[PDB]
Design a protein around this ligand. Sequence first.
Ligand SMILES: Nc1ccn([C@H]2CC[C@@H](COP(=O)(O)O)O2)c(=O)n1
Length: 223
Amino acid sequence: AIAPVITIDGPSGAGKGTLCKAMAEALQWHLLDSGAIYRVLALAALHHHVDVASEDALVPLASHLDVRFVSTNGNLEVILEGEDVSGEIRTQEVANAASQVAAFPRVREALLRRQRAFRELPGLIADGRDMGTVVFPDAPVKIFLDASSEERAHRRMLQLQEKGFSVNFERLLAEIKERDDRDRNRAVAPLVPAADALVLDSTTLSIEQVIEKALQYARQKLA
Ligand SMILES: Nc1ccn([C@H]2CC[C@@H](COP(=O)(O)O)O2)c(=O)n1
């Protein structure tokens, strides 16, 4: 009776965002960008002067985190307390704060019900780190999108250059190196692929190939 869910987990810069949107549109399903939740929580903490390195301080904020997401009128907008912060949550200051807040056990549990509420018919495409291992363990379809850290740093560099930002590959390689250690080195819902997850390594695959392989797999298990 419950709605089917396709989980897409993987490290930062693996291309989950792009894949999820493409699958959601292809199947006309709902989307959940769990990372945006942790980022909106982080931005909230910064604006409310809540200690980002304090589990006690963060828990209250997470439990009442006022965040809504708007459908695809073209893309997706993240709202915090009535204000669009879609761009601000994508800043390095918020990305860093987000990994900080997502590290605490009680803070993550305080966000479980909120993420799980996204499971609604006809289906949900869930993007994150632990969608297939903690949030939605029973997902009929689980995908682990991964790629070498070097490639993910290279793609990042290029995207920042497109936007007109001056970058340095060495810095980006360390940046993703540090994020990977966090998401993967924490006794609390670490980044690990589910045993039944399709491991999609996109290092030498194009956006088109990834989407094609993902949909082939998902459609296979759901019809
Ligand atoms: N399901 C998730 C999604 C995200 N995060 C953390 C990883 C860093 C931060 C932001 O994630 P993203 O870079 O994917 O926006 O939140 C997490 O712990 N669990």
